[PDB]
């Protein structure tokens, strides 16, 4: 339930082939950017960095949880379905 890893914008690159090492079976890669992740404060900051470096990018807008209406008294409603059968 912690939300402290959903504060900052990230930039990552498309995933490319990994394969099995013939000797030990480890995951081999030829992608130099496979573990590259960058952190930004705003979307405008992240985009500007990709533009000057010449990378094409697809931005995804932040998903903010909606405010809900929580009522503890609703659990024992008289004529509504929100009454709970157990605590």
């Amino acid at each position: 339930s912690g939300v402290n890893n959903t504060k900052k914008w990230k930039m990552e690159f498309d995933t490319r082939e990994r394969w099995e090492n013939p000797l030990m079976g480890w995951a081999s890669t030829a992608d130099p950017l496979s573990n590259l992740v960058l952190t930004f404060s705003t979307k405008e900051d992240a985009v500007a960095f990709a533009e000057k470096n010449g990378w094409s990018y697809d931005v995804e807008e932040r998903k903010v949880p909606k405010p809900k209406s929580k009522s503890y008294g609703a659990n024992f409603s008289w004529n509504k379905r929100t009454r709970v059968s157990t605590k």
Binding site: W78, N79, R81, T82, R83, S85
Partner: protein, 45 residues
């Protein structure tokens, strides 16, 4: 009528049996007022 404060007059309950309480509730039902209704047969309805 004498104020004979020397006997225990709560001896009736020594004859009650298994269904005494629920038998009294059955007789009492003819007296109760109509119950209120929430509107639905249950919260799951």
């Amino acid at each position: 009528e004498p104020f004979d404060n020397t006997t225990y007059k709560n001896l009736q309950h020594h004859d009650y049996s298994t269904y005494t309480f629920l038998d009294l509730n059955l007789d009492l039902s003819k007296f109760r007022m109509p119950q209120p209704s929430s509107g639905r047969e249950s919260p799951r309805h």
